[PDB]
Amino acid sequence: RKLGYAILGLGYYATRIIMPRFAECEHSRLAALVSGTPEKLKTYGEQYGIPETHRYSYETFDRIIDNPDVDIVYVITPNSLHRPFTERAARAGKHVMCEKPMANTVADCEAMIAACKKAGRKLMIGYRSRFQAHNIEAIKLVRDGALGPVRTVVTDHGFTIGDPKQWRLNRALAGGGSLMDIGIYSLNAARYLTGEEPVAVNAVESTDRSDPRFGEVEDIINFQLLFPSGATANCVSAYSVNCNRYRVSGPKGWVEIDPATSYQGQAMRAQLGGPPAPREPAPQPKNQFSAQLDHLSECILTGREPIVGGDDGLKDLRVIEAIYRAAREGRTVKL
Amino acid sequence: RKLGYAILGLGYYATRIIMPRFAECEHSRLAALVSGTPEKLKTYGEQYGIPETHRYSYETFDRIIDNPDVDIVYVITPNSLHRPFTERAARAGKHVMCEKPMANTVADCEAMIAACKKAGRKLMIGYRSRFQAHNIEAIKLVRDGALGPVRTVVTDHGFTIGDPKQWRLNRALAGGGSLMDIGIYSLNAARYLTGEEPVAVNAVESTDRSDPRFGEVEDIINFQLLFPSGATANCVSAYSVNCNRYRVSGPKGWVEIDPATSYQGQAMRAQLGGPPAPREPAPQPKNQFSAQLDHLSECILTGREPIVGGDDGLKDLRVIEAIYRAAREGRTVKL
Ligand SMILES: NC(=O)C1=CN([C@@H]2O[C@H](COP(=O)(O)OP(=O)(O)OC[C@H]3O[C@@H](n4cnc5c(N)ncnc54)[C@H](OP(=O)(O)O)[C@@H]3O)[C@@H](O)[C@H]2O)C=CC1
Ligand SMILES: NC(=O)C1=CN([C@@H]2O[C@H](COP(=O)(O)OP(=O)(O)OC[C@H]3O[C@@H](n4cnc5c(N)ncnc54)[C@H](OP(=O)(O)O)[C@@H]3O)[C@@H](O)[C@H]2O)C=CC1
Ligand SMILES: O[C@@H]1[C@@H](O)[C@@H](O)OC[C@H]1O
Ligand SMILES: O[C@@H]1[C@@H](O)[C@H](O)OC[C@H]1O
Ligand SMILES: O[C@@H]1[C@@H](O)[C@H](O)OC[C@H]1O
Ligand SMILES: O[C@@H]1[C@@H](O)[C@H](O)OC[C@H]1O
Ligand SMILES: O[C@@H]1[C@@H](O)[C@H](O)OC[C@H]1O
Ligand SMILES: O[C@@H]1[C@@H](O)[C@H](O)OC[C@H]1O
Ligand SMILES: O[C@@H]1[C@@H](O)[C@H](O)OC[C@H]1O
Numbered sequence: 001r002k003l004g005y006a007i008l009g010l011g012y013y014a015t016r017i018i019m020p021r022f023a024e025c026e027h028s029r030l031a032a033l034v035s036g037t038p039e040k041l042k043t044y045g046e047q048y049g050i051p052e053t054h055r056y057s058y059e060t061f062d063r064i065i066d067n068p069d070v071d072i073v074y075v076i077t078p079n080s081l082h083r084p085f086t087e088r089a090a091r092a093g094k095h096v097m098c099e100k101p102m103a104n105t106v107a108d109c110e111a112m113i114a115a116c117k118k119a120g121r122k123l124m125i126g127y128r129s130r131f132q133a134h135n136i137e138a139i140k141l142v143r144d145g146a147l148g149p150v151r152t153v154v155t156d157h158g159f160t161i162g163d164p165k166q167w168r169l170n171r172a173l174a175g176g177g178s179l180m181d182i183g184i185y186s187l188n189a190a191r192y193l194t195g196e197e198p199v200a201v202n203a204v205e206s207t208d209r210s211d212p213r214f215g216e217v218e219d220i221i222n223f224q225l226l227f228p229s230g231a232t233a234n235c236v237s238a239y240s241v242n243c244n245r246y247r248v249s250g251p252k253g254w255v256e257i258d259p260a261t262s263y264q265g266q267a268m269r270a271q272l273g274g275p276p277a278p279r280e281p282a283p284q285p286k287n288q289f290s291a292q293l294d295h296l297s298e299c300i301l302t303g304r305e306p307i308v309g310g311d312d313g314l315k316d317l318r319v320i321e322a323i324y325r326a327a328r329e330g331r332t333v334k335l
Numbered sequence: 336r337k338l339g340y341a342i343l344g345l346g347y348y349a350t351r352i353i354m355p356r357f358a359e360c361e362h363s364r365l366a367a368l369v370s371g372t373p374e375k376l377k378t379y380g381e382q383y384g385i386p387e388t389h390r391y392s393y394e395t396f397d398r399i400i401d402n403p404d405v406d407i408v409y410v411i412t413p414n415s416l417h418r419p420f421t422e423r424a425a426r427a428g429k430h431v432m433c434e435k436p437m438a439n440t441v442a443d444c445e446a447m448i449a450a451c452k453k454a455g456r457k458l459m460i461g462y463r464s465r466f467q468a469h470n471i472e473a474i475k476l477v478r479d480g481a482l483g484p485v486r487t488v489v490t491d492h493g494f495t496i497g498d499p500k501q502w503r504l505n506r507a508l509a510g511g512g513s514l515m516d517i518g519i520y521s522l523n524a525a526r527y528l529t530g531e532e533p534v535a536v537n538a539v540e541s542t543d544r545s546d547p548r549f550g551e552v553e554d555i556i557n558f559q560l561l562f563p564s565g566a567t568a569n570c571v572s573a574y575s576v577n578c579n580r581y582r583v584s585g586p587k588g589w590v591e592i593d594p595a596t597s598y599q600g601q602a603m604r605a606q607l608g609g610p611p612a613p614r615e616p617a618p619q620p621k622n623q624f625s626a627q628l629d630h631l632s633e634c635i636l637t638g639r640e641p642i643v644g645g646d647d648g649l650k651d652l653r654v655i656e657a658i659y660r661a662a663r664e665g666r667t668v669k670l
């Protein structure tokens with residue numbers, strides 16, 4: 001009925017966003033905590049009724065293999081740590097939910113996929129937008145042919161990042177800048193809205209290296225995608241402006257969401273045979289976070305593959321590598 | 336005090352949009368008609384009370400040198416004809432308003448500029464948006480520092496073009512496809528919102544050559560611009576989707592208009608400190624078309640240079656050549 005989650009990395013997303021949302025889950029429960037901060041184990045163990053036997057440090061984490069209440073490890077650490085904790089979780093016989101971006105590189109994703117396959121365990125990447133009501137509505141409008149063939153996707157993701165000392169601005173822990181953290185939503189959306197994989201990539205980077213935030217990673221890196229159908233995407237990724245939106249357009253009309261992939265507050269507008277009008281999406285059973293959690297559990301219960309498996313995360317990293325290359329080399333990169 | 340316009344090329348824009356707007360002008364009046372269609376000279380000549388003496392064919396147009404009621408010739412023909420009518424107008428001692436795109440090529444714009452300079456006559460390009468209230472307001476917000484430094488401009492212009500036989504879809508008359516006709520608004524806006532000129536250009540083209548519309552010119556061509564300040568732009572140009580908008584963003588906020596550069600219907604939304612909210616622009620004394628007409632007239636009366644002179648048209652054609660080249664060569668073109 002309910003599979004047990006171990007949450008690993010008790011930072012902002014784990015504690016403010018994910019852990020409260022087991023409340024609306026139907027097939028998932030909070031079973032264990034893994035943290036490098038003993039104080040957090042006490043604080044959250046007490047809040048959520050997690051016994052000391054089900055609390056782990058990073059030093060004792062591998063012992064989770066012996067805990068049958070844990071089915072899934074949800075890795076919610078800085079990006080460069082996704083690969084080793086995923087592999088350790090897999091060797092501990094656990095299924096894995098891994099936050100985006102999946103890892104720093106293509107090779108690292110391949111390694112993760114291989115370790116989970118070797119363990120005979122499922123791997124899913126935290127693309128919660130695939131469970132969000134408005135995003136699902138947009139995807140379905142496209143698939144139903146409401147727009148005709150997709151011609152353009154224009155999508156902007158970014159926020160004004162603050163503290164220079166934080167791990168996202170540290171290349172060794174983040175793997176890269178805005179593209180790794182928030183621009184990936186633009187890429188991921190261009191992919192699920194078209195339902196295609198890009199065959200050509202352009203990119204331009206713009207970073208003020210005198211800014212205390214941007215000594216190591218990039219601020220803005222905007223990119224263009226071409227798809228086999230002829231569909232195109234213009235994407236923004238930024239750490240110096242606030243944006244969160246996409247519009248997908250075809251000859252028969254368009255639909256947009258703004259904000260598109262935020263935690264809440266989505267608003268959709270469509271232009272489909274008349275002037276633009278607000279469009280309310282079909283109701284979903286539960287919020288995107290609880291839905292994401294239950295999706296992995298239900299896949300395990302039914303022996304099915306997640307809609308956003310390791311291969312989806314790998315496909316993003318492939319294009320991300322090409323985006324960085326296109327900007328570096330000032331040429332169109334073919335995929 | 337009103338200067339006399341001769342309207343040349345009595346097509347849709349001239350007769351449906353421009354000529355009615357002489358009504359609200361304070362320094363411009365309709366003085367003459369130039370047309371290759373005799374019945375149009377009679378119909379519009381009678382409607383606007385233009386005497387037969389002030390009606391010209393393309394054959395007799397050069398005689399306009401001897402009409403002192405004509406101060407300005409407004410060229411509103413297919414693009415490929417902008418240069419020769421502008422040059423002939425200049426040699427007739429007339430100032431010239433020329434519709435966008437200025438001409439097919441950089442070289443042609445340079446020739447037009449030289450001809451008007453030789454004549455000692457002013458040349459202005461029909462970038463009406465520079466006189467439109469919402470556009471003026473966006474520029475003001477940028478200039479006044481409301482956004483901080485411009486980081487991104489995301490702008491989409493396109494419409495679903497119809498009849499395959501029209502001159503816009505004929506290379507010899509149009510000089511190019513969507514970029515020449517409607518994508519130029521994206522480019523022009525990126526330039527006047529930043530107040531800068533691009534130093535690097537990326538582009539991607541997507542055109543279905545089996546479509547009856549697109550045997551000769553491009554459908555979609557999207558492009559990226561990098562500016563000296565670090566500002567960036569992502570732009571759509573399209574003949575197969577409907578769009579008309581821009582958002583300009585900086586670290587302190589953003590402002591967008593959708594539709595941005597239409598004949599009417601502009602709506603502005605801004606995010607400045609708090610949630611996105613409607614913004615009403617400062618009122619303008621008259622509509623963008625009358626304002627455009629009077630601007631050239633007032634420049635002539637006061638001995639000032641137009642804010643959108645020939646050099647602005649030239650600057651757009653320089654980037655347009657670079658956009659076409661970047662798409663063709665699949666590399667970043669430097670300017
Ligand atoms: N899908 C979404 O909407 C979101 C996804 N994310 C993803 O979640 C992951 C974490 O993001 P966020 O929670 O915002 O990051 P935080 O910095 O808020 O928390 C990160 C946690 O990882 C653990 N950690 C382990 N080693 C380190 C280390 N060397 N340096 C810093 N922290 C370490 C710590 O938890 P402890 O103290 O328990 O060891 C730390 O609190 C990232 O991969 C991010 O991309 C983030 C936000 C939203
Ligand atoms: N600023 C704006 O908002 C707009 C600008 N424009 C610009 O105005 C110009 C014309 O646009 P539009 O008025 O829509 O085009 P139309 O086809 O509606 O009018 C074109 C006119 O140019 C004259 N002309 C001269 N030679 C030719 C030729 N060989 N083939 C066809 N027409 C010819 C004709 O007038 P006659 O019969 O009198 O010779 C024809 O009616 C273009 O440069 C376009 O980009 C257009 C629309 C909006
Ligand atoms: O002029 C616009 C008005 O018509 C409305 O749409 O609200 C915003 C304004 O910019
Ligand atoms: O980023 C981490 C922060 O989320 C946590 O609260 O304290 C430890 C830091 O490493
Ligand atoms: O209950 C949550 C608490 O555990 C966390 O520390 O702060 C966010 C709250 O929503
Ligand atoms: O728990 C984390 C610890 O393991 C790391 O070394 O420093 C950052 C902490 O958040
Ligand atoms: O930095 C955060 C990013 O990691 C998340 O995925 O999207 C929201 C951002 O605030
Ligand atoms: O041939 C041209 C015709 O197409 C236009 O409509 O009238 C002007 C002529 O020069
Ligand atoms: O084709 C037209 C283009 O020329 C004009 O500038 O913008 C409106 C479009 O309809």
Ligand SMILES: O[C@@H]1[C@@H](O)[C@H](O)OC[C@H]1O
Pocket residue numbers: 540541542543544
């Ligand atoms: O999109 C294609 C473009 O790349 C090519 O050069 O012109 C033909 C189009 O089909």
